[PDB]
Amino acid sequence: LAAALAQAL
């Protein structure tokens, strides 16, 4: 989930 956020932004 941390990486999901990173990628989205």
Residues ending a continuous segment of the chain before a break (C–N > 2.5 Å)? none
Instruction: Dump the DSSP string for 1-9.
Output: -HHHHHHH-
**What is the C-alpha to C-alpha distance for residues 8 and 2, in angstroms, rounded to an integer?**
10
Lookup: tokens for 2? 């941390």
Please provide residue 7's backbone torsions phi and psi, each rounded to the nearest 5 degrees.
-65, -45
**What is the C-alpha to C-alpha distance for residues 4 and 7, in angstroms, rounded to an integer?**
5
**What is the C-alpha to C-alpha distance for residues 7 and 9, in angstroms, rounded to an integer?**
5
Experimental method: X-ray
